Design a protein around this ligand. Structure first.
Ligand SMILES: CCCCCCCCCCCCCCCCCC(=O)OC[C@H](CO[C@@H]1O[C@H](CO[C@H]2O[C@H](CO)[C@H](O)[C@H](O)[C@H]2O)[C@H](O)[C@H](O)[C@H]1O)OC(=O)CCCCCCCCCCCCCCCCC
Ligand SMILES: CCCCCCCCCCCCCCCCCC(=O)OC[C@H](CO[C@@H]1O[C@H](CO[C@H]2O[C@H](CO)[C@H](O)[C@H](O)[C@H]2O)[C@H](O)[C@H](O)[C@H]1O)OC(=O)CCCCCCCCCCCCCCCCC
Ligand code: CLA
Ligand code: CLA
Ligand code: CLA
Ligand code: CLA
Ligand code: CLA
Ligand SMILES: CC1=C(/C=C/C(C)=C/C=C/C(C)=C/C=C/C=C(C)/C=C/C=C(C)/C=C/C2=C(C)CCCC2(C)C)C(C)(C)CCC1
Ligand SMILES: CC1=C(/C=C/C(C)=C/C=C/C(C)=C/C=C/C=C(C)/C=C/C=C(C)/C=C/C2=C(C)CCCC2(C)C)C(C)(C)CCC1
Ligand SMILES: CC1=C(/C=C/C(C)=C/C=C/C(C)=C/C=C/C=C(C)/C=C/C=C(C)/C=C/C2=C(C)CCCC2(C)C)C(C)(C)CCC1
Ligand SMILES: CC1=C(/C=C/C(C)=C/C=C/C(C)=C/C=C/C=C(C)/C=C/C=C(C)/C=C/C2=C(C)CCCC2(C)C)C(C)(C)CCC1
Ligand code: OEX
Ligand SMILES: [Ca+2]
Ligand SMILES: [Cl-]
Ligand SMILES: [Cl-]
Ligand SMILES: [Fe+2]
Ligand SMILES: [Mg+2]
Lengths: 29, 334, 37, 81, 451, 342, 38, 34, 62
């Protein structure tokens, strides 16, 4: 159960991380 | 212009008191046939063996029904999904015994009402309107398809289509509850939110527009005379209406944009009713309401009933009693 | 079950099918970042 | 606008989150413990899973008297030994 | 940023993808990335199904929809549909999952990095929606692609191990199809069959020879049609009948997909050939017939004469006549007498169910199958409690047939709505009144009054 | 005049995010408690002692099955006040006896009064006609008839609806099996007003949205409206022609249209309330006497009306022992009405 | 103190993810412990 | 520049405070076994 | 060969994660596109290689 919630945490954050990294760097959003 | 060109011009004419159009070319004869057959059957049809067990059910006024009990009764379970036009029967007497009028009526009706929907697009196009009134009508239409066609398909018989009658409708509902626990199905719950909410918002909108009508009349006349057909100026004060409703709840829960408000008025009931239709159309394939029968159990394993279990007892009553002579085997599988 | 060599990836495999749904939700995060302009 | 601070101002401020990264988790944990300690059962009189029936009993403890209803419940509770 | 707000595009965020109508590069990205999503799901869902899969339980007891598709193609299964090798399932899943990365790569590239429009870059890849010839050419390419797809199925069936045949003599098994039905009278005859009971249009297809032959025809039709559309431009009558715009073409496809959705719904509900009951569970008709069969067997073992047993209504309790006289099971399942299945057919004679065969020839494998199907009828709750709506919690079951029929009805329905929405909008936009009525040129104001 | 009353009036009527008013003094506590009581009960409180049911998240129910259930039948129509002779000030015992039911029903009722007073108060301050408050009389007639008058005509609050999703569904099915409530022409008028109201909501919203004037360049048309604009945003003339040609008739008067939108669902709800007042007394539309006389003498005479009564008889026999535990019903297997096989 | 420091799109994404987690837990609880039928 | 404790502030907290308390309670319940 | 396999697959997973975040960020970032384009080329060739490695080693571990 701990292994499954860690995966969806890394996978879950990936999308919002992409946006965040781009917003910080004044990317082409 | 040649004859065909002239005919086309008349059919598609924006000047006919009732628009005809190409959808109307199919709609008019099909709706007339369905209407005429329905009226005659509702008054004069003999009893119909709905459940294919040689137990004819009387639907017509002359055979002992009133407006509330009367129906055009669904075609025989012996027929199932077989196409049963008049010409497949050896006689009108046979056709009537087996519920032929039901099939004639619902097939002409469904075709005609589909064309009614197309015709709404069609006229909107001829008048230079936006096209989506027909999309709103797709909600009741989809609902009619669900109860007259999709449910019969899933269950394997037009004998399980909704009867064309007031009490027959209630019969369909009660049996549907027994067999699908529709009340516990989220699509029917969305349907209820759709129609309760539709009524709420209807009353709300009515009351708010009425509340803010601009004074144009005296007390000895209807305020309705304060509006003239085709006038350019709006007849109520939307700013006062929003000023009222925004204070009733809070500012940002109220619409100040009439286009947004009217879109919401269209969308809420239409989407809910689409879900209602889809509830029937998916319970047609026996994906049923939530089943929490014996979901709550104590430390020993005793069943602790919830309201779901009381629902279940009511459903059992319906189940065991419906079509009391039709089942020979222990499970009701369609 | 997956072949035994891959068994360690079971928890990952349990999560993968839901990923497409995350793309729809992502569209909303992105739009929120540009102020739904 | 009605004079109060805009919500969007408040919930995008550091101070709001300094306060609320404490108060929100504190409330949540207090709610959790209200249940996990069993206090909820005691406050409301809700049966625990082992307290719906005595060991051999299969009859519901239904209240059948209006004015001695309090005592009846108390008697039902005693019979759980 | 070109066209990425409402002021410049004319489309609000919630209609944001309409901003892509005339940006062929970004729109290619959207499409390729989306194809990625479909392939991703196919791959990931398969791996999920495989990881959860217990080979000795029926697939239909396990919430599986994708493994059944692979098994029907003859991969991983043997006699009776028993799983003999899970490796083909693993391969299908992995290869789709890997392929999705590629598609996702191309989609993301075109969508955010590549040229926004393709027309200045390439005359071959660029397009104008209103360029009728270019539209039919691209359509032509895709028809050829689809025809090859259909022939891939033929190849599997004829040259690469065959297909799962529920009807195979001596019991269901994977079988190579050597004599596909080429006769156009049989193939196109399906297309002209009534969709009503006892007929069922194309859904009635009941043997793999007809299935494979149909795909030979469809493959050739699609390749020929593709070549046709590359080599021609739309005729005058077609030009005058249609709206020629991106949104119009979308609407035509939405209509088509809606139709296909409803067909697929009926296919999985009734058909037990291309949806073998070994993998998908019994059909509704099948399970109801299986119940009648079960109790006929039980009571006959006890000494009942099932031919002469009169039920409460006067109709035979176990056996009666259809409206054309065929001997059929009785009770409510009278409606399902058009059902046909490998476990039942051996009891069928020229006149329907044969009483002498019933009395003497029912084999234990038929009893087992009828009992299995009766107790896996496609009835169950949304939370997957198996059985009738009043059944108690205990069995975790909803038939794959129910999952597949309901989902596809919902999808087909909303796609009909999308068709109407986009067809009506395409018409209005083409004619120039999709944004509302011109106040100074209101058409109704120039029309005579109705009365 | 500038006393404390007028100073209080000033503060109460300040233009703030959430308007208060004199009506707020009734509304806010009563609504808050009604809602709080429901959330409290559905989260933590049992129905074991009143109904023999679990009804809270604490016991394992979900959002669909949680309820605040009515008191035991033996309570009759007791106000069941916390300090009353039943609970005698004991909060725990009060919960176990169904005190939260009358708590929610009664604060709910006073809260609804407060809301309608709020509608009047705000209308008066803003200077609009009070048709919103008038329309709200329909919700009030429903709440009062169903949650108060109905159980008051019956043996006890036990037979009022319990506050819960599944519980309300049980209430619907009870009314079918016991009252044949579908057969009641007052319920039928309610149905027509609700469905007719939903129809009017959809059709009017769609008609306005599809007869819009082009007032902007945007393909998304919402921005092309201004609250303060004088002009109609859509064409009544084009709308009128459309419906006249499609349906045969059409609205031509906007004031009438909008009044009708008030009238229909409001009148429907009021009609349903009248029927429920009859049901409080078991004064049902249960039967058609002519139907029964015929069917009793003629075993071949069958209608959908006679079929539905068989369903009702099943509902009653199958649900009563568990639904009405104070009756101590024991119905041997052999007496239960059942058709063949099932 | 200053309004705007933490972008509204982050607050919404985090709050939204919080709602999904809690609702998800409630659905997990439908299959385990009390109310699970087991 | 802005007040903190307003009628709005009170209204918000009469709802939000019990809501979070209740959500914690209901979360804990998911781990209760018979 | 299980040591080679189990880490090659972990390396496949890890790189995929890096690429999933890295490719879109690079594509939409204004500066350092020269350095990015080669890294994406490198990552892609290495991703493809690892797929083939896992694919081959599969048969010596199953
Ligand atoms: C442009 C469009 C043109 C339209 C113009 C109108 C022309 C009329 C169209 C006919 C309308 C369909 C009515 C009958 C539908 C039906 O009973 O469909 C069922 C049939 C399948 O029929 C079944 O097919 C079966 C085939 O199985 C047989 O063969 C199998 C082989 O494995 C098995 O052995 C099986 O046991 C055996 O019985 C049997 O023959 C059954 O008896 C038979 O009932 O599906 C089918 O033909 C195909 C599926 C039909 C589509 C489903 C309709 C849904 C549309 C509603 C949309 C809603 C609108 C909303 C508006 C807002
Ligand atoms: C309009 C919208 C405006 C907004 C509405 C605002 C909401 C305000 C809230 C008001 C709440 C009123 C609760 C009334 C409780 C009640 O009644 O409680 C009932 C009691 C009577 O008690 C009952 O009495 C019954 C009969 O007893 C009698 O008979 C028995 C058997 O023979 C014994 O002899 C017994 O000792 C003897 O007392 C049973 O005992 C019941 O169990 C017991 O509850 O009367 C009483 O308190 C008072 C009875 C007279 C006044 C009733 C006025 C209000 C109710 C009008 C509705 C009428 C219903 C008719 C249905 C149609
Ligand atoms: C299948 C879903 C889908 C797809 C494929 C697209 C595709 C697209 N949209 Mg639409 N959109 C969608 C759903 C989708 N949309 C939904 C649900 C909404 C409502 C919220 C919208 C609302 C919307 C608006 C308002 C707009 C678009 C626009 C666009 C285009 C440009 C996007 C951009 O500029 O990114 C900028 C964003 C970034 C740079 C952030 C990163 C985004 C990347 C793509 C994420 C990739 C993540 C992935 C895991 C990486 C894997 C890589 C790996 C394979 C190596 C692009 C072609 C725009 C357009 O039309 O421009 C002309 C536009 O204005 N969309
Ligand atoms: C054709 C589509 C389809 C079908 C038929 C199935 C079928 C099934 N799936 Mg699969 N799956 C799908 C798509 C589908 N899935 C997608 C898109 C994903 C990614 C999220 C998954 C990932 C997945 C997982 C992880 C699992 C399943 C499982 C299952 C089984 C149990 C399903 C269940 O309990 O539902 C529960 C019902 C719901 C959640 C209700 C869905 C209602 C939606 C929201 C309504 C949609 C309405 C409409 C489309 C929206 C339009 C709005 C309108 C205004 C326009 C069942 C065999 C389970 C299983 O048994 O695996 C072995 C399982 O664990 N699926
Ligand atoms: C419908 C799919 C599709 C289409 C029509 C295009 C079209 C285009 N691409 Mg894109 N792209 C795609 C998908 C697609 N791409 C995918 C999946 C990827 C990831 C691998 C990419 C990554 C990509 C990059 C990095 C670039 C392009 C570029 C181009 C342009 C020039 C291509 C060329 O000259 O080929 C000429 C033909 C060949 C090189 C031979 C093709 C060999 C193919 C692959 C044989 C196999 C075909 C087979 C039938 C495919 C079946 C797949 C199916 C199972 C899904 C053109 C606009 C270029 C660009 O836009 O310039 C600025 C460019 O730099 N594409
Ligand atoms: C995706 C598939 C596809 C699409 C979108 C198109 C699109 C087009 N085709 Mg092509 N075509 C295709 C595949 C396709 N084609 C294939 C596979 C072949 C080989 C058989 C052809 C051979 C072909 C020819 C010979 C012609 C076209 C033509 C056209 C154009 C007008 C078609 C039309 O008016 O249809 C509407 C259909 C009709 C008007 C036919 C009568 C309608 C009846 C009443 C409907 C009955 C069906 C009903 C729904 C029930 C179905 C069951 C039924 C069989 C019983 C249009 C650009 C025309 C063109 O302009 O060529 C350049 C034309 O002459 N196509
Ligand atoms: C305006 C807001 C409001 C209103 C209308 C009500 C109304 C009600 N409450 Mg609710 N309540 C409120 C706010 C309100 N409450 C608040 C803020 C709380 C939190 C403390 C509560 C907590 C609460 C509980 C726990 C209960 C109620 C209950 C009740 C009911 C019976 C009350 C009663 O009999 O009072 C009688 C008192 C009056 C009507 C006041 C009379 C004032 C007169 C005019 C002055 C005379 C008094 C005099 C000075 C005293 C001298 C006496 C001397 C001879 C000894 C009724 C529905 C009960 C109920 O719901 O049971 C099912 C119940 O148990 N309330
Ligand atoms: C195969 C694979 C993979 C993959 C991956 C991927 C592909 C991913 C992705 C991802 C993603 C794709 C993600 C995402 C996400 C997301 C999210 C998480 C979201 C969200 C959201 C929300 C929460 C929202 C909200 C909101 C807003 C924003 C606004 C308005 C309002 C609201 C509230 C609605 C990997 C590498 C692992 C490796 C192995 C295998
Ligand atoms: C444009 C756009 C969009 C979209 C996007 C997309 C749609 C995409 C995609 C994509 C994709 C579609 C992707 C992907 C991917 C993938 C991957 C990354 C993969 C992989 C894999 C792997 C790594 C594997 C592995 C394995 C194996 C080999 C075996 C067994 C186990 C395992 C599973 C471990 C949006 C909405 C946001 C918006 C903005 C724009
Ligand atoms: C594979 C297969 C097969 C085969 C198949 C086939 C051979 C087919 C087909 C098909 C087809 C061959 C089809 C079709 C079609 C068609 C359509 C779907 C159409 C349409 C149309 C339309 C839509 C139109 C329109 C219009 C009109 C009416 C008027 C004027 C205007 C317009 C133009 C708009 C079989 C069954 C043996 C078996 C199994 C498998
Ligand atoms: C009774 C009483 C009282 C009071 C109390 C109160 C006032 C309370 C409260 C309370 C409260 C105030 C609570 C709460 C809460 C809550 C909750 C529990 C919630 C929730 C939620 C949710 C779960 C959500 C979700 C959802 C939805 C619905 C929407 C959409 C989506 C979703 C799914 C997200 C007193 C002391 C005077 C006295 C005696 C009695
Ligand atoms: O037909 Mn009219 O309802 Ca449908 O489930 Mn089986 O079938 Mn009879 O029982 Mn129950
Ligand atoms: Ca235990
Ligand atoms: Cl019945
Ligand atoms: Cl039967
Ligand atoms: Fe209006
Ligand atoms: Mg639980």
């Amino acid at each position: 159960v701990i292994a499954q919630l860690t995966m969806i945490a890394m996978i879950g954050i990936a999308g919002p991380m992409i946006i965040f990294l781009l917003a910080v760097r004044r990317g082409n959003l | 212009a040649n004859l065909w060109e002239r005919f086309c011009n008349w059919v598609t004419s924006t000047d006919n008191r009732l628009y005809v159009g190409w959808f109307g070319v199919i709609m008019i004869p099909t709706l007339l046939a369905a209407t005429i057959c329905f009226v005659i059957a509702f008054i004069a049809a003999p009893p119909v063996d709905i459940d294919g067990i040689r137990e004819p059910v009387s639907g017509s006024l002359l055979y002992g029904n009133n407006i509330i009990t009367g129906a055009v009764v669904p075609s025989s379970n012996a027929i199932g999904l077989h196409f049963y036009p008049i010409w497949e029967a050896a006689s009108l007497d046979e056709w009537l015994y087996n519920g032929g009028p039901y099939q004639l009526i619902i097939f002409h009706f469904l075709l005609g009402a589909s064309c009614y929907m197309g015709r709404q697009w069609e006229l909107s196009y001829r008048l230079g309107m936006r096209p989506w009134i027909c999309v709103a009508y797709s909600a009741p239409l989809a609902s009619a398809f669900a109860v007259f066609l999709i449910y019969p398909i899933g269950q394997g018989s037009f004998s399980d289509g909704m009867p064309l009658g007031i009490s027959g409708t209630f019969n369909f509902m009660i049996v549907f509850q027994a067999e699908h626990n529709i009340l516990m199905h989220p699509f029917h719950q969305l349907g209820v939110a759709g129609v309760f909410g539709g009524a709420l918002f209807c009353a709300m909108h009515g009351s708010l527009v009425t509340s803010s009508l601009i004074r144009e009349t005296t007390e000895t006349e209807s305020a309705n005379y304060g509006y003239k057909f085709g006038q350019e100026e709006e007849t109520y004060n939307i700013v006062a209406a929003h000023g009222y409703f925004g204070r009733l709840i809070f500012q940002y829960a109220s619409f100040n944009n009439s286009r947004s408000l009217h879109f919401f008025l269209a969308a809420w009931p239409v989407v809910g009713v689409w879900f209602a239709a889809l509830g029937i159309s998916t319970m047609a394939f026996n994906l049923n309401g939530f089943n929490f029968n014996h979901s709550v159990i104590d430390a020993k394993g005793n069943v602790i009933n919830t309201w779901a279990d009381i629902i279940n007892r009511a459903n059992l009553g319906m189940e065991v009693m419906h079509e009391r002579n039709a089942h020979n085997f222990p499970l009701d599988l369609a | 079950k997956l072949p035994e060599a891959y068994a360690i990836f079971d928890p990952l495999v349990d999560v993968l099918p839901v990923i497409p749904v995350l793309f729809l939700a992502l569209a909303f995060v992105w739009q929120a970042a540009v102020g739904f302009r | 606008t009605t004079g109060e601070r805009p919500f969007s101002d408040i919930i995008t401020s550091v101070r709001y989150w300094v306060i609320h990264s404490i108060t929100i988790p504190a409330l949540f944990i207090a709610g959790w413990l209200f249940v996990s300690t069993g206090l909820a059962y005691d406050v409301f009189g809700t049966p625990r899973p082992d307290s719906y029936y005595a060991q051999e009993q299969r009859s519901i403890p239904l209240v059948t008297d209006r004015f001695e209803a309090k005592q009846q419940v108390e008697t039902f509770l005693e019979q759980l030994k | 940023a070109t066209n990425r707000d409402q002021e410049s595009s004319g489309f609000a965020w919630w209609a944001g993808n309409a901003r892509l109508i005339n940006l062929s590069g970004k729109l290619l990205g959207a499409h390729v990335a989306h194809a990625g999503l479909i392939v991703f799901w196919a791959g990931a869902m398969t791996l999920f199904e495989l990881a959860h899969f217990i080979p000795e339980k029926p697939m239909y007891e396990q919430g599986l929809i994708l493994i059944p598709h692979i098994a029907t193609l003859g991969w991983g299964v043997g006699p009776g549909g028993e799983v003999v090798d899970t490796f083909p399932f693993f391969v299908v899943g992995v290869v789709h999952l890997i392929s999705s990365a590629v598609l996702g790569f191309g989609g993301v590239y075109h969508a955010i990095r590549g040229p926004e429009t393709l027309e200045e870059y390439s005359s071959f890849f660029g397009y104008d929606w209103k360029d009728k010839n270019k539209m039919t050419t691209i359509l032509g390419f895709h028809l050829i692609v689809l025809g090859i797809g259909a022939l891939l199925l033929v190849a599997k069936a004829m040259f690469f191990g065959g297909l799962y045949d529920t009807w195979a003599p001596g019991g269901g098994d994977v079988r190579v199809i050597t004599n596909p039905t080429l006769d156009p009278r049989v193939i196109f005859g399906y297309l002209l069959k009534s969709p009503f009971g006892g007929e069922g249009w194309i859904v009635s297809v009941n043997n793999l020879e007809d299935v494979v032959g149909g795909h030979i025809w469809i493959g050739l039709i699609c390749i020929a049609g593709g070549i046709w559309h590359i080599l021609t431009t739309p005729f005058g009558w077609a030009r005058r009948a249609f709206i020629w715009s991106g949104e119009a073409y979308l609407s035509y496809s939405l209509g088509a997909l809606s139709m296909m959705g409803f067909i697929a719904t009926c296919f999985v509900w009734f058909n037990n050939t291309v949806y073998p009951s070994e993998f998908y569970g019994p059909t509704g008709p099948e399970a109801s017939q299986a119940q009648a069969m079960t109790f006929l067997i039980r009571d006959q073992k006890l000494g009942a004469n099932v031919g002469s047993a009169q039920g409460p209504t006067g109709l035979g309790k176990y056996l009666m006549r259809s409206p054309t006289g065929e001997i059929i099971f009785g009770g409510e399942t009278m409606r399902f007498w058009d059902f046909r299945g490998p476990w039942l057919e051996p009891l069928r004679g020229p006149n329907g169910l044969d009483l002498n065969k019933i009395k003497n020839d029912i084999q234990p494998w038929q009893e087992r199958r009828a009992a299995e199907y009766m107790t896996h009828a496609p009835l169950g709750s949304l939370n997957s409690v198996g059985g009738v709506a009043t059944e108690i919690n205990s069995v975790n079951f909803v038939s794959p047939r129910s999952w597949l029929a309901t989902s596809h009805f919902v999808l087909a329905f909303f796609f009909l709505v999308g068709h109407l929405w986009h067809a009506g909008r395409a018409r209005a936009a083409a004619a120039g009144f999709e944004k509302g009525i011109d106040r100074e040129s209101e058409p109704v104001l120039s029309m005579p009054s109705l009365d | 005049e500038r006393g404390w009353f007028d100073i209080l009036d000033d503060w109460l009527k300040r233009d703030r995010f959430v308007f208060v008013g004199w009506s707020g003094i009734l509304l806010f506590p009563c609504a808050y408690l009604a809602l709080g009581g429901w959330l409290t009960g559905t989260t933590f409180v049992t129905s074991w002692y009143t109904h023999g049911l679990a009804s809270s998240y604490l016991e394992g129910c979900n959002f669909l099955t949680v309820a605040v259930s009515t008191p035991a039948n033996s309570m009759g129509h007791s106000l069941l006040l916390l300090w009353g002779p039943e609970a005698q000030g004991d909060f725990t015992r009060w919960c176990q006896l169904g005190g939260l039911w009358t708590f929610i029903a009664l604060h709910g009722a006073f809260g609804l009064i407060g809301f309608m007073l709020r509608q009047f108060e705000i209308a008066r301050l803003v200077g609009v006609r009070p048709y919103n408050a008038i329309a709200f009389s329909a919700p009030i007639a429903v709440f009062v008839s169903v949650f108060l008058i109905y159980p008051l005509g019956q043996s006890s609050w036990f037979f009022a609806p319990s506050f819960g999703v599944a519980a309300i569904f049980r209430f619907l099915l009870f009314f079918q099996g016991f009252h044949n409530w579908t057969l009641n022409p007052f319920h039928m008028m309610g149905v027509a007003g609700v469905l007719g109201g939903a129809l009017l909501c959809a059709i009017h919203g769609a008609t306005v949205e599809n007869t819009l004037f082009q007032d902007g360049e945007g393909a998304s048309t919402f921005r092309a409206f201004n609250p303060t604009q004088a002009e109609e945003t859509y064409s009544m003339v084009t709308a009128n022609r459309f419906w006249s040609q499609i349906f045969g008739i059409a609205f031509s008067n906007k004031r009438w249209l909008h009044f009708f939108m008030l009238f229909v669902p409001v009148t429907g709800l009021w009609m349903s309330a009248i029927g429920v007042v009859g049901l409080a007394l078991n004064l049902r539309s249960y039967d058609f006497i002519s139907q029964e006389i015929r069917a009793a003498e003629d075993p071949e005479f069958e209608t959908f009306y006679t079929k539905n009564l068989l369903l009702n008889e099943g509902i009653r026999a199958w649900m009563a022992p568990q639904d009405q535990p104070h009756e101590n019903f024991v119905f041997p297997e052999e007496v239960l009405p059942r058709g063949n096989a099932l | 103190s200053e309004g705007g420091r933490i972008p509204l799109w982050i607050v919404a994404t985090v709050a939204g993810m919080g709602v999904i987690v809690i609702v998800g837990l409630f659905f997990y609880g439908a299959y385990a412990g009390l109310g699970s039928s087991l | 520049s802005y007040p903190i404790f307003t009628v709005r502030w009170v209204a918000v907290h009469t709802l939000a405070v019990p809501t979070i308390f209740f959500l914690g309670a209901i979360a804990a319940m998911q781990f209760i076994q018979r | 060969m299980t040591i080679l396999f189990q880490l090659a697959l972990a390396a496949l997973v890890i790189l995929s994660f890096v690429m999933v975040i890295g490719v879109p960020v690079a594509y939409a970032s204004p500066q350092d596109w020269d350095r990015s384009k080669q890294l994406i080329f490198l990552g892609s060739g290495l991703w493809i290689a690892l797929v083939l490695v896992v694919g081959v080693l599969n048969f010596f571990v199953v």
